[PDB]
């Protein structure tokens, strides 16, 4: 029910950050988060940051 993936969005939204800022650093402040071991594919968060990034800015 793209459940994980719309947490995911909701997340990233409300957790307004840095735009410089790169995924190895986001993800290390929220490496920690249930969230983000939750997804297996790596590539899938690395596409939505530079999706984020490219559609925040």
Do not use: C, G, Y
Request: proline fraction near 2%; avoid cysteine; charged fraction near 40%.
């Amino acid at each position: 029910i793209m459940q994980a993936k719309e947490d995911f969005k909701k997340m990233m939204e409300e957790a307004k950050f840095n735009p410089r800022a790169t995924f190895s650093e986001f993800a290390a402040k929220h490496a920690k988060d249930s969230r983000f071991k939750a997804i297996e594919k790596m590539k899938d968060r690395e596409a939505l940051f530079n999706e984020f990034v490219a559609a925040a800015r």
